[PDB]
Scaffold this active site. Structure first.
Site, PDB file in Angstrom:
ATOM      1  N   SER B  32       0.776  -1.119  -0.084  1.00 57.97           N
ATOM      2  CA  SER B  32      -0.017  -0.134   0.318  1.00 57.97           C
ATOM      3  C   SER B  32       1.107   1.500  -0.897  1.00 57.97           C
ATOM      4  O   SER B  32       1.780   1.431   0.533  1.00 57.97           O
ATOM      5  CB  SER B  32      -0.989   0.027   1.399  1.00 57.97           C
ATOM      6  OG  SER B  32      -1.654   1.043   1.441  1.00 57.97           O
ATOM      7  N   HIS B  63      -3.675  -9.510 -14.440  1.00 62.40           N
ATOM      8  CA  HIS B  63      -2.167  -8.658 -15.391  1.00 62.40           C
ATOM      9  C   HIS B  63      -1.624  -8.616 -13.937  1.00 62.40           C
ATOM     10  O   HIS B  63      -1.131  -9.231 -13.680  1.00 62.40           O
ATOM     11  CB  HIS B  63      -2.199  -7.524 -14.635  1.00 62.40           C
ATOM     12  CG  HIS B  63      -3.188  -6.193 -16.109  1.00 62.40           C
ATOM     13  ND1 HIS B  63      -4.710  -6.907 -16.192  1.00 62.40           N
ATOM     14  CD2 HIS B  63      -3.057  -5.484 -17.078  1.00 62.40           C
ATOM     15  CE1 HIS B  63      -5.130  -6.351 -17.077  1.00 62.40           C
ATOM     16  NE2 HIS B  63      -4.407  -5.899 -17.882  1.00 62.40           N
ATOM     17  N   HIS B  85       1.202 -13.044  -1.092  1.00 63.78           N
ATOM     18  CA  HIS B  85      -0.140 -13.231   0.232  1.00 63.78           C
ATOM     19  C   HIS B  85      -0.604 -14.018   0.430  1.00 63.78           C
ATOM     20  O   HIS B  85      -0.701 -15.185  -0.522  1.00 63.78           O
ATOM     21  CB  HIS B  85      -1.222 -11.705   0.552  1.00 63.78           C
ATOM     22  CG  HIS B  85      -0.592 -10.777  -0.147  1.00 63.78           C
ATOM     23  ND1 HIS B  85      -0.910 -10.244  -0.703  1.00 63.78           N
ATOM     24  CD2 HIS B  85      -0.275 -10.157   0.879  1.00 63.78           C
ATOM     25  CE1 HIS B  85      -0.311  -8.680  -1.394  1.00 63.78           C
ATOM     26  NE2 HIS B  85       0.466  -8.275  -0.012  1.00 63.78           N
ATOM     27  N   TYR B  87      -2.790 -15.074   2.078  1.00 68.05           N
ATOM     28  CA  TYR B  87      -4.056 -15.643   2.246  1.00 68.05           C
ATOM     29  C   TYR B  87      -4.417 -16.120   0.578  1.00 68.05           C
ATOM     30  O   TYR B  87      -6.040 -16.355   0.513  1.00 68.05           O
ATOM     31  CB  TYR B  87      -5.203 -14.309   2.822  1.00 68.05           C
ATOM     32  CG  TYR B  87      -4.544 -13.073   2.268  1.00 68.05           C
ATOM     33  CD1 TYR B  87      -4.390 -12.843   0.579  1.00 68.05           C
ATOM     34  CD2 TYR B  87      -3.611 -11.961   2.821  1.00 68.05           C
ATOM     35  CE1 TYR B  87      -4.848 -11.876  -0.147  1.00 68.05           C
ATOM     36  CE2 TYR B  87      -3.564 -10.634   1.775  1.00 68.05           C
ATOM     37  CZ  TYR B  87      -4.344 -10.634   1.019  1.00 68.05           C
ATOM     38  OH  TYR B  87      -3.932  -9.547   0.152  1.00 68.05           O
ATOM     39  N   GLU B  88      -3.504 -16.084  -0.321  1.00 70.94           N
ATOM     40  CA  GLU B  88      -3.915 -15.909  -1.527  1.00 70.94           C
ATOM     41  C   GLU B  88      -3.617 -17.623  -1.521  1.00 70.94           C
ATOM     42  O   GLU B  88      -4.131 -18.001  -2.720  1.00 70.94           O
ATOM     43  CB  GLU B  88      -3.745 -15.043  -2.179  1.00 70.94           C
ATOM     44  CG  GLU B  88      -3.673 -13.856  -2.604  1.00 70.94           C
ATOM     45  CD  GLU B  88      -4.925 -13.329  -3.656  1.00 70.94           C
ATOM     46  OE1 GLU B  88      -5.377 -12.082  -2.952  1.00 70.94           O
ATOM     47  OE2 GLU B  88      -5.691 -14.249  -3.960  1.00 70.94           O
ATOM     48  N   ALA B 115      -0.382  -1.928   3.487  1.00 75.12           N
ATOM     49  CA  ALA B 115      -1.229  -1.236   4.535  1.00 75.12           C
ATOM     50  C   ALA B 115      -1.437  -1.991   5.681  1.00 75.12           C
ATOM     51  O   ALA B 115      -1.996  -3.506   6.063  1.00 75.12           O
ATOM     52  CB  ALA B 115      -2.342  -1.466   3.852  1.00 75.12           C
ATOM     53  N   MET B 218      -1.596  -8.591   7.274  1.00 72.68           N
ATOM     54  CA  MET B 218      -1.750  -9.762   6.507  1.00 72.68           C
ATOM     55  C   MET B 218      -0.699 -10.036   5.665  1.00 72.68           C
ATOM     56  O   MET B 218      -0.942 -10.795   5.049  1.00 72.68           O
ATOM     57  CB  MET B 218      -3.407 -10.608   5.898  1.00 72.68           C
ATOM     58  CG  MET B 218      -4.747  -9.276   6.430  1.00 72.68           C
ATOM     59  SD  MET B 218      -5.620  -9.624   4.935  1.00 72.68           S
ATOM     60  CE  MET B 218      -6.885  -8.677   6.272  1.00 72.68           C
ATOM     61  N   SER B 219       0.122  -9.463   6.175  1.00 73.78           N
ATOM     62  CA  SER B 219       1.773  -9.807   4.655  1.00 73.78           C
ATOM     63  C   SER B 219       3.015  -9.601   5.709  1.00 73.78           C
ATOM     64  O   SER B 219       3.105  -9.124   6.933  1.00 73.78           O
ATOM     65  CB  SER B 219       1.248  -8.719   3.057  1.00 73.78           C
ATOM     66  OG  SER B 219       1.937  -6.783   4.070  1.00 73.78           O
ATOM     67  N   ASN B 242      -6.766   1.706   7.860  1.00 68.18           N
ATOM     68  CA  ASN B 242      -8.231   1.983   8.760  1.00 68.18           C
ATOM     69  C   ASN B 242      -7.899   1.536  10.292  1.00 68.18           C
ATOM     70  O   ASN B 242      -6.571   0.736  10.664  1.00 68.18           O
ATOM     71  CB  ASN B 242      -8.996   0.971   8.688  1.00 68.18           C
ATOM     72  CG  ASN B 242      -8.276  -1.074   8.307  1.00 68.18           C
ATOM     73  OD1 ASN B 242      -7.519  -0.633   7.358  1.00 68.18           O
ATOM     74  ND2 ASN B 242      -8.351  -1.013   9.114  1.00 68.18           N
ATOM     75  N   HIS B 256     -11.616  -3.123   1.695  1.00 69.35           N
ATOM     76  CA  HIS B 256     -10.010  -2.798   0.730  1.00 69.35           C
ATOM     77  C   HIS B 256     -10.298  -1.637   0.361  1.00 69.35           C
ATOM     78  O   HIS B 256      -8.698  -1.300  -0.216  1.00 69.35           O
ATOM     79  CB  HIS B 256     -10.177  -4.074   0.143  1.00 69.35           C
ATOM     80  CG  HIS B 256      -8.705  -3.891  -0.211  1.00 69.35           C
ATOM     81  ND1 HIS B 256      -7.733  -4.190  -0.114  1.00 69.35           N
ATOM     82  CD2 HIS B 256      -8.611  -4.173  -1.619  1.00 69.35           C
ATOM     83  CE1 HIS B 256      -6.471  -4.346  -0.169  1.00 69.35           C
ATOM     84  NE2 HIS B 256      -7.142  -3.929  -1.905  1.00 69.35           N
TER      85      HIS B 256
HETATM   86  N1  LIG Z   1      -5.227  -7.625   9.153  1.00 68.89           N
HETATM   87  C1  LIG Z   1      -5.584  -6.612   8.418  1.00 68.89           C
HETATM   88  N2  LIG Z   1      -4.800  -6.090   7.611  1.00 68.89           N
HETATM   89  C2  LIG Z   1      -4.512  -4.723   6.283  1.00 68.89           C
HETATM   90  C3  LIG Z   1      -6.363  -4.122   6.948  1.00 68.89           C
HETATM   91  N3  LIG Z   1      -5.762  -3.000   6.798  1.00 68.89           N
HETATM   92  C4  LIG Z   1      -5.095  -3.046   5.539  1.00 68.89           C
HETATM   93  N4  LIG Z   1      -5.138  -4.177   5.506  1.00 68.89           N
HETATM   94  C5  LIG Z   1      -4.246  -5.342   4.200  1.00 68.89           C
HETATM   95  O1  LIG Z   1      -4.073  -4.866   3.185  1.00 68.89           O
HETATM   96  C6  LIG Z   1      -5.066  -5.844   2.867  1.00 68.89           C
HETATM   97  C7  LIG Z   1      -6.570  -5.355   2.818  1.00 68.89           C
HETATM   98  O2  LIG Z   1      -7.037  -4.511   2.959  1.00 68.89           O
HETATM   99  C8  LIG Z   1      -4.771  -7.176   3.138  1.00 68.89           C
HETATM  100  O3  LIG Z   1      -3.887  -7.194   1.854  1.00 68.89           O
HETATM  101  C9  LIG Z   1      -4.039  -6.015   4.884  1.00 68.89           C
HETATM  102  O4  LIG Z   1      -2.649  -6.827   4.793  1.00 68.89           O
HETATM  103  C10 LIG Z   1      -6.696  -3.818   8.350  1.00 68.89           C
HETATM  104  O5  LIG Z   1      -7.020  -3.459   8.925  1.00 68.89           O
HETATM  105  N5  LIG Z   1      -6.511  -5.443   9.088  1.00 68.89           N
END
Ligand SMILES: Nc1nc2c(ncn2[C@@H]2O[C@H](CO)[C@@H](O)[C@H]2O)c(=O)[nH]1
Ligand SMILES: Nc1nc2c(ncn2[C@@H]2O[C@H](CO)[C@@H](O)[C@H]2O)c(=O)[nH]1
Lengths: 258, 284, 276
Positions: B32, B63, B85, B87-88, B115, B218-219, B242, B256
């Site tokens: 981000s 892409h 990631h 999660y993917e 992010a 998450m990364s 956020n 997102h």
């Molecule tokens: N777990 C978590 N990930 C977030 C948050 N905001 C942005 N991210 C990251 O941005 C993506 C989701 O918005 C994911 O790949 C997250 O790593 C959040 O509030 N909590």
């Protein structure tokens, strides 16, 4: 690899039973024994492979099997792989499992070389769906949902302390909660702080999975962490080996016996 | 996927070295807020992941991600445009390989943004939280990116994460931010990885905050672990995209889109910040 | 296991729709305290191609409190080794079948010290330990036909359903049994150690179980509203010195003892659900 069910574990145990007459009553996984028989894992079919040895013999007048060569989750070993040796111990006659490991000391009153008898554990991987028991329950060995009540047998802990106390190194012995970090990274200061605050005293990357398997099949467990490092909380073994070895020998000496 | 072992990583590295004369000193993982940074690399050579045999494949709605070589403030960089990631569902090897490739390419410093939700109550939307530490929840479970046979070629079996977030790089980043008048946006804190891809429930956020976590994402951590494992210095910043909701009663919810929007809004500043940090990185 | 993607879910949904014309608006996942449906067809999971298999388990359609319901009799627990796709598919099938509201019960350990055996703890939130640790049921390619890549879990436990649940319990004389709380998932299948329970309690968890969250996450992901209740089938033992321990047979007994009340509650809840 090989499902740790009664049939496969029976196979390995039956094989080992040809390799030795020693029916061990005590299992020992180390993190000196008399009349010993050293059976390399390589010799054992369908037994997990590290090179490791399964040492049978007599220790303080008791039949023991020692696991030399451990199977850690961080190495990528499956649940069954790690379970199998413990369940083999069960079939071989092991009633008591004594485990030592190296751990980082979270509790701020711990010092290098301290012994922390596990009186309880926090199985982080277990809570997070990496419990060694995940998958079909092997009903021959234990119940679907084992309680982990008195998992670290209080009587054995009592005895270990007494043995340490009577042998002048009672000052080294603590009892605490062991938390498993799946590893293989050492814990960050933030992780250590979190773990301490979770009520953890020592943190390591092993043992719990074995304990769970042991308890699952009704093997009493004794487990001690040697504090081989003091956890750093903010980002800003060989020594005690022979003492701990002596300790294990002396505890065994006083283990009850049928 | 393909094992992030020395052979496969060399293959990939060598393939890449056929495609660019750029020996990167700095790796940049575009999270981000860094989308614009990627675009600013001078004298780009853009190598789509699809053109690199055995390189992990990831797409942005079809892409392919790209490896971007060139310079940035007079320093040779490789930008990863497209991260993997967990999660993917990417594997440890998939995530690890690109970092290990960076190692063989000559990367000494890894800069990564991501992010994250602001758990720490003092954080504001748009704040930069330099990671000074992390809590690798998946790692503490049995989902550490290093689980499995250790690739000795790249690092030791039990890496310490002491100074994972290089304190000097952190100090530099803070100074650059200070000098350029956005020091106030800049915080340092603990990043906790939620494997995801669900945003945290309020209870989870409350728990994570009580664990001493400042931001949650998450990364990043797996990349950082791989980086540290192979001795690449890491600088990492979370963009607070956020404010974590700690209250179940709240109607506010993480989405997102707003995360992307905060990234977009802060991308220019983050680019500038990174560019200016890079220019002040020690040596050459 | 077949991928819980739209194609596979559609196939399953369709084969099911061959076996029944009951369009369910309420999905019920029976855990402790559940196990009444009128005008019902019982579709054994064994009769549903690609539908996950558990012991057989039944997909029960019919009418409950005037509402079309599908009751999942036979649950898929992660500790059994079931895959994400396997646990997700049935919820996604529900979605396709027309389910709007998922009501789920489970057995959980009472961490919160104010809890009594046989209490109901309405989930108002959860802590998805496996989910935080990279074992989230949604890990893998997002199935876009079902939901967004990054679902929010705000109001995951629909506050309106919770309110209704509490009111229904209140007026039917058992509001004293009903709490609301945070459910933490322990992947299981071990009961928590005393140290784990103490930690979980301190994390702000009221009840601990080995289920539910994955289905709830999938339900929320595809926009199914969720109501979930833990039956406190055992008081978690936080004291390592204690002789008290959890026991599945006792857990089962406590669930069954409360089943009828739970049934009544769910029925009376479904009774008061808004009809459009
Ligand atoms: N777990 C978590 N990930 C977030 C948050 N905001 C942005 N991210 C990251 O941005 C993506 C989701 O918005 C994911 O790949 C997250 O790593 C959040 O509030 N909590
Ligand atoms: N984790 C956990 N699950 C419980 C407890 N009590 C009942 N259960 C549930 O009931 C079954 C075992 O009793 C599992 O499926 C659990 O989800 C408890 O104290 N802890």
């Amino acid at each position: 690899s090989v499902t740790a069910n009664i049939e496969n574990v029976k196979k390995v145990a039956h094989h080992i039973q040809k390799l030795t007459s020693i029916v061990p009553e005590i299992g020992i996984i180390c993190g000196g024994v008399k009349d010993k028989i050293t059976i390399p894992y390589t010799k054992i079919p369908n037994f997990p492979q590290t090179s490791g040895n399964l040492i049978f013999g007599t220790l303080s007048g008791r039949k023991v099997v020692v696991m030399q060569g451990r199977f850690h989750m961080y190495e990528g070993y499956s649940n069954d792989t790690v379970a199998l040796p413990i369940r083999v111990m069960k079939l071989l006659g092991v009633k008591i499992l004594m485990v030592s490991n190296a751990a980082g000391g979270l509790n701020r009153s711990l010092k290098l070389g301290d012994f922390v008898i596990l009186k309880d554990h926090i199985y982080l991987p277990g809570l997070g769906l990496n419990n060694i028991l995940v998958g079909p329950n092997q009903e021959a060995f234990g119940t679907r949902f084992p309680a982990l009540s008195n998992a670290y047998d209080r009587d054995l802990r009592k005895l270990a302390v007494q043995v340490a106390e009577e042998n002048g190194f009672g000052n080294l012995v603590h009892q605490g909660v062991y938390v498993m970090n799946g590893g293989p990274c050492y814990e960050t200061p933030a992780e250590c702080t979190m773990l301490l605050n979770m009520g953890c005293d020592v943190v390591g990357m092993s043992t719990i999975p074995e304990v769970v398997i042991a308890r699952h099949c009704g093997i009493q467990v004794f487990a001690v962490s040697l504090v081989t490092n003091i956890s750093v909380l903010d980002v800003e073994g060989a020594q005690r080996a022979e003492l701990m070895q002596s300790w294990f020998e002396k505890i065994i000496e006083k283990l009850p016996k049928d």
